[PDB]
Amino acid sequence: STIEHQMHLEKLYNKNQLLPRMRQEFEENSGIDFKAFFAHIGIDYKFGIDAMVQMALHKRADLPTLVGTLRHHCKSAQEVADNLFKMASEDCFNFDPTIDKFIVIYTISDDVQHELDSFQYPLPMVVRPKLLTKNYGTGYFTCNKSVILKKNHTDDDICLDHLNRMNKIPLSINWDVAHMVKNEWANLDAFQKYDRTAHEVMGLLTQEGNKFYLTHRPDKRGRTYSQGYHVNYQGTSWNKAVLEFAEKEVID
Amino acid sequence: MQTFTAREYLKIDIANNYGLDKEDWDDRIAWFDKNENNLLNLVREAEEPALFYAGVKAWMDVKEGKPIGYPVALDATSSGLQILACLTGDRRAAELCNVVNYRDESGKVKRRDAYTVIYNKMLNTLGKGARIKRNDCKQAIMTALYGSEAKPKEVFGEGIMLNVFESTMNVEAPAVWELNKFWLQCGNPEAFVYHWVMPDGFNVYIKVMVNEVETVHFLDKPYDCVRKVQGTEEKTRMLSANTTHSIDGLVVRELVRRCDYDKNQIEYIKALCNGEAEYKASEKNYGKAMELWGYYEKTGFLTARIFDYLDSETIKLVNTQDILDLIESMPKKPFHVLTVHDCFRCLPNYGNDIRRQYNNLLATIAKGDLLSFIMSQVIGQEVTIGKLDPTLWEDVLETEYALS
DNA sequence: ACCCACCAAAAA
RNA sequence: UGGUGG
């Protein structure tokens, strides 16, 4: 039941990986038939969908920024920028020469944007995380990516013991503080965006109990980072305040 | 090191979040005692409202005798400078950043703010209208310790102000500053990656990623497209930041090992050290046990991680008295510790222990040879750096505001 | 010529 | 390309 709840949470995370989930809005969910249209204007299918996706993310983006995300499709940096003009001239999105940016035209639905805001980022585990024994897998039951942050994988010793020790610290939400933030933080002070969906996630998270585990990953140097956006003892002050130990103690 | 009650760490933490975190311990508790009965109304003017409120609600729950899950926070005062001071034995740098105690003429131990101390020293000598803001000075200092030459050149120009800035740094922290100096001249123009091992076995690999700029035309106007690519570079400015950060990383892993320990593992190792454990042996433990003990020998940093590889056969290669001494230096009751690289949070009835464990680690770095051990791996040959004051470590154990 | 990690996406 | 924490 909690094992099942954990698999559901992981089910949502795996289904809302940002870029694959966005692509769905331009492939199998668009009324527009971008495959057919991209053939017409002589733009590679996978490239065109990705450019459309990048525009739904950035909304506005200068040229060096936009080619960076798409550079891996062509043998030349130049080939990418030309393809982008062909699409801008065919109204896939606009380029405004007076601000030197592309501006999105076709954006994803609001309903899909909210699921991405809730679930594209890792959540806490509601069972004890998997014991790490190799430098693959980060504690969840369905991810087996490199445990080291960014592209810095090694199979050398990176002190899994510390990750394993931090991962089993049970945490819970202080709803008294969490409610204080939503009702009164805005008049005490990126924040609105986080808080729009944070409480919904925290309630879903703790559906089976106010007890959970944050996963931890090392960067290449050995600084240790707890993974997650909405619930995290690292990161923002409105974030820090809500977390406490699940194993409370009488102080004296 | 003076100790505090569990409730007092709560008092300090609530003071910190108001916050008067640069005040001495007793002034902070004095401020608290004064506002104990009015805390909920100060939430709206506190520096960290949410954290202030959580701590205050915890204080109330404690008064009523209720259990709490709220962890108080104790932060390192300039983590990096502390580590460079300990690596180099730089007693003057240590006094900037609470690695050892600084007393004013009255003789009270003060909570020093290195950036302010150096800001004062710079106005004191520049004098007579010095056109420099305290925060422009803090940015230049902290970017320098991570190896920047461009940012102090921007705050101080490239003239006499810069000259006074480097002069001040060289009197207040000669060895720390000389070491940062040295790291710059330590890049290898042939290297694609740097690798070093920490004494607890963490392998640090730094791939050298250099900018490749493809230039592009879009409407016959030019755009520069820069992508990080693996390569080499003549100098490199990254080693001071990465080595220093690898060490505060180490301090975090090891501090969490010493605080959040498995009491049953501890008792097994204690019997194992005293020859009373039932025979158990695995051939796979030998390599790692040998490896970690070696780092202790070469560095002075005995990691409690070694408990994971000690068995009936492997204990024979280590000094059982050193293992027992380590366990005895650990807290008598374990506790969870949350860490933000150089911030530490725990239940307040363990406040005293977390400050003791941090002190011991700074002191270990101070006493031993970690810098040589790491520099040798970075530059590719055996080098030895000496302590500028080899007894600094004695005072480090007893220092007051390392965490504040 | 400053380290890392991460988020965040903009208006007739 | 701006912000978050260190």
Q: What is the dihedral of CA A225, A228, A233, A234, to 10 degrees?
A: 50
Which amino acid makes up residue B295?
Answer: Y
Last residue of a domain, one of A44, A74, A103: A103
A2: in domain? no
| Residues A32, A94 share a domain | yes
Q: Residue A173 has which token pair?
A: 């939400």
| Residues A238, A146 share a domain | yes
Among all residues of chain B, which has the CA nearest to that of A218?
A: B249
The span from the CA of B266 to the CA of A23, in Å, is: 53
| Residues A140, A78 share a domain | no
CA distance A221 to chain B (A): 5
* CA proximity to B371, closest of B86, B181, B80, B76: B86
Of B248, B308, B340, the CB nearest to A234: B340
A117: in domain? no
Q: Is B138 assigned a ligand-binding role in the annotation? A: yes
Domain, as residue range, for A70: 17-103
Give DSSP secondary structure letters for A146-206. Answer: BSSSSS---SS---HHHHHHHHT--EEE-HHHHHHIIIIITTT--HHHHHHHHHHHHHHHT
Angle CA B364–B370–B373, to nearest 5: 155
Q: Does B226 touch chain A (CB under 8 A)?
A: yes
According to DSSP, the residues that pair with A172 across neighbouring strands are A244
Among all residues of chain A, which has the CA nearest to that of B223?
A: A64
| Residues A152, A240 share a domain | yes
Helix, strand, coil: what percent of chain B each, to 5?
55, 10, 35
Q: Do A78 and B216 touch (CB under 8 A)?
A: yes
A166: in domain? yes
A250: in domain? no
| Residues A219, A154 share a domain | yes
Of A157, A245, A246, the CB nearest to B202: A157
The span from the CA of B51 to the CA of B48, in Å, is: 5
From the CB of residue B333, how many other CB atoms can be counted at a distance below 10 Å?
Answer: 11
Length of chain A: 252
Q: Do A63 and B201 touch (CB under 8 A)?
A: no
For A210 and D4, how far is CA from C1' in angstroms?
A: 26
SS (H, E, C) A92-155: CCEEECCCCEEECCCCCCHHHHHHHHHHCCCCCECCCCCCCCCCECCCCCCCCCECCCCCCCCC
Among all residues of chain B, which has the CA nearest to that of A86?
A: B218
A-contacting residues of B 31-60, CB under 8 Å?
43-44, 48-51, 53-54, 57
Q: Which of residues 93-122 of A touch strand C (CB under 7 A)?
A: 103-104, 107, 117, 121
Would you list the domain boundaries of chain B? 1-404
| Residues A233, A149 share a domain | yes
Q: What is the dihedral of CA B206, B209, B210, B215, to 10 degrees?
A: -170
Q: Contact at 8 Å (CB) between B99 and B263?
A: no
Angle CA A168–A170–A172, to nearest 5: 155
Please give the C-alpha separations between residue A225 and each of A166, B279, B361, in angstroms, as whole numbers: 10, 38, 21
| Residues A167, A62 share a domain | no
| Residues A127, A241 share a domain | yes
Please give the C-alpha separations between residue A241 and each of A14, A174, A195, A231, B31, in angstroms, as whole numbers: 28, 8, 13, 10, 22
Q: Contact at 8 Å (CB) between B70 and B58?
A: yes
| Residues A197, A90 share a domain | no
A199 touches strand C (CB under 7 A): no
A98: in domain? yes
Element (H, E) at A225: strand A224-227
The span from the CA of B266 to the CA of B308, in Å, is: 10
Block residue for tokens 């503080």: A177
Rg for chain A, CA atoms, rounded = 22
Q: Resolution of the coordinates in A? A: 3.2
* CA proximity to B266, closest of B321, B202, B201, B331: B331
| Residues A217, A138 share a domain | yes
Of B67, B218, B249, the CB nearest to A85: B218
Last residue of a domain, one of A103, A132, A150: A103
Mention every residue, 6+ apart, whose C-beta is less than 8 A from residue B318: B289, B293, B306, B310
Q: Do B71 and A84 touch (CB under 8 A)?
A: no
Q: Do A81 and B206 touch (CB under 8 A)?
A: no
| Residues A177, A139 share a domain | yes
The span from the CA of A162 to the CA of B258, in Å, is: 11
Element (H, E) at B125: helix B114-126
Mention every residue, 6+ apart, whose C-beta is less than 8 A from residue B340: A233, A234
Block residue for tokens 């004064």: B34
Length of chain B: 404
Q: Which of residues 138-197 of A touch strand C (CB under 7 A)?
A: 149-150, 152, 190, 193-194
Give DSSP secondary structure letters for B216-227. Answer: EESSS-EEEEEE
For A189 and C8, how far is CA from C1' in angstroms?
A: 19
| Residues A192, A238 share a domain | yes
A7: in domain? no
A173: in domain? yes
Angle CA B403–B151–B91, to nearest 5: 40
Domain count, chain A: 2
Block residue for tokens 């499709």: A73
Angle CA B180–B183–B186, to nearest 5: 165
The span from the CA of A11 to the CA of A143, in Å, is: 11
From the CB of residue B28, how many other CB atoms can be counted at a distance below 10 Å?
Answer: 24
A206: in domain? yes
Among all residues of chain B, which has the CA nearest to that of A179?
A: B50
For A196 and C12, how far is CA from C1' in angstroms?
A: 28
Q: Residue A192 has which token pair?
A: 């609105």
Q: Where chain B is broken, by preceding residue (C–N > 2.5 Å)?
A: none
Q: Residue B149 has which token pair?
A: 């030459």
Q: Contact at 8 Å (CB) between B214 and B256?
A: no
B19 cis-preceded (ω within 30 degrees of 0): yes
